Curated annotation (Swiss-Prot):
In the egg white and polymorphonuclear leukocytes. Its main location: secreted. Lysozymes have primarily a bacteriolytic function; those in tissues and body fluids are associated with the monocyte-macrophage system and enhance the activity of immunoagents. Has bacteriolytic activity against M.luteus. Its EC number is 3.2.1.17. The keyword Disulfide bond applies. It is found in: Secreted. It catalyses: Hydrolysis of (1->4)-beta-linkages between N-acetylmuramic acid and N-acetyl-D-glucosamine residues in a peptidoglycan and between N-acetyl-D-glucosamine residues in chitodextrins. This is Lysozyme C. It holds the Pfam family Lys. Lysozyme C is capable of both hydrolysis and transglycosylation; it also shows a slight esterase activity. It acts rapidly on both peptide-substituted and unsubstituted peptidoglycan, and slowly on chitin oligosaccharides. Residues 1-129 form the C-type lysozyme domain. One of its GO terms (molecular function) is identical protein binding. It is an enzyme of class 3 (hydrolase).
Length: 129
């Protein structure tokens, strides 16, 4: 599923991401835009042989199992395929563990490089939330 910007903002808010670990909703929407362009089916191979999955490009190196990332972990206890669903519950549940790991949203390099310090409220502008 390719979410609309406000559609994704609504979904993230409902699942309690808005201000989770102090990160306002626009930060999450901004991270999703540059990770996945709001596409739940997005997959990208990393240099290390891990893969990133779904709207928030969650990495098989630590967070989900994909059966092809040797020496990796599954800290969200889910198949990586579950992070490609049209229903973002599993991605949000796992993203809450990631952002709690100690470096906040710096875990998402695209957030640090493209969202951090910027006018992230623009991403929820005009949304009926
Ligand atoms: Na893994």
């Amino acid at each position: 599923k390719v979410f609309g910007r406000c559609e994704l903002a609504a979904a993230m808010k409902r699942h309690g991401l808005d201000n989770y670990r102090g990160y306002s909703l626009g930060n999450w929407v901004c991270a999703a835009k540059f990770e996945s362009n709001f596409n739940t089916q997005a997959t990208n191979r990393n240099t290390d042989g891990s893969t990133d999955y779904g709207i928030l490009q969650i990495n098989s190196r630590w967070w989900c199992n994909d059966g092809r990332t040797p020496g990796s972990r599954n800290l969200c206890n889910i198949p990586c395929s579950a992070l490609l669903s049209s229903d973002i519950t599993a991605s949000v549940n796992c993203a809450k563990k990631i952002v709690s790991d100690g470096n906040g949203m710096n875990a998402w390099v695209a957030w640090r490089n493209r969202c951090k310090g910027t006018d992230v409220q623009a991403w929820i502008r005009g949304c009926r939330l």
